[PDB]
């Protein structure tokens, strides 16, 4: 187990979509609730 020398081969890959599916639901939603409709976006 390492950080890059390991994660490599898949890590940089995984992100293939992660950066997308990861941002969606695992970020977007994180925009709701906490806001409830206050400071809203930004």
**C-alpha span between 35 and 13 (Å, rounded):** 33
Domain count, the chain: 1
Please indicate if the annotation marks 10 as binding a ligand.
yes
Which pair of tokens denotes residue 28?
């977007």
Which pair of tokens denotes residue 8?
């490599």
Q: Which domain holds residue 12?
A: 1-42
CATH number of the domain that 31 lies in? Answer: 4.10.230.10
DSSP string, the chain: --SSTTTTTTHHHHHHHIIIIITTTTTSGGGSSSSTTSS---
Please indicate if the annotation marks 39 as binding a ligand.
no
**C-alpha span between 28 and 33 (Å, rounded):** 11
Contact 27, 37 (CB under 8 A): no
């Amino acid at each position: 187990d390492a950080e890059f020398r390991h994660d490599s081969g898949y890590e940089v890959h995984h992100q293939k979509l992660v950066f997308f599916a990861e941002d969606v639901g695992s970020n977007k939603g994180a925009i709701i609730g906490l806001m409830v409709g206050g400071v809203v976006i930004a």
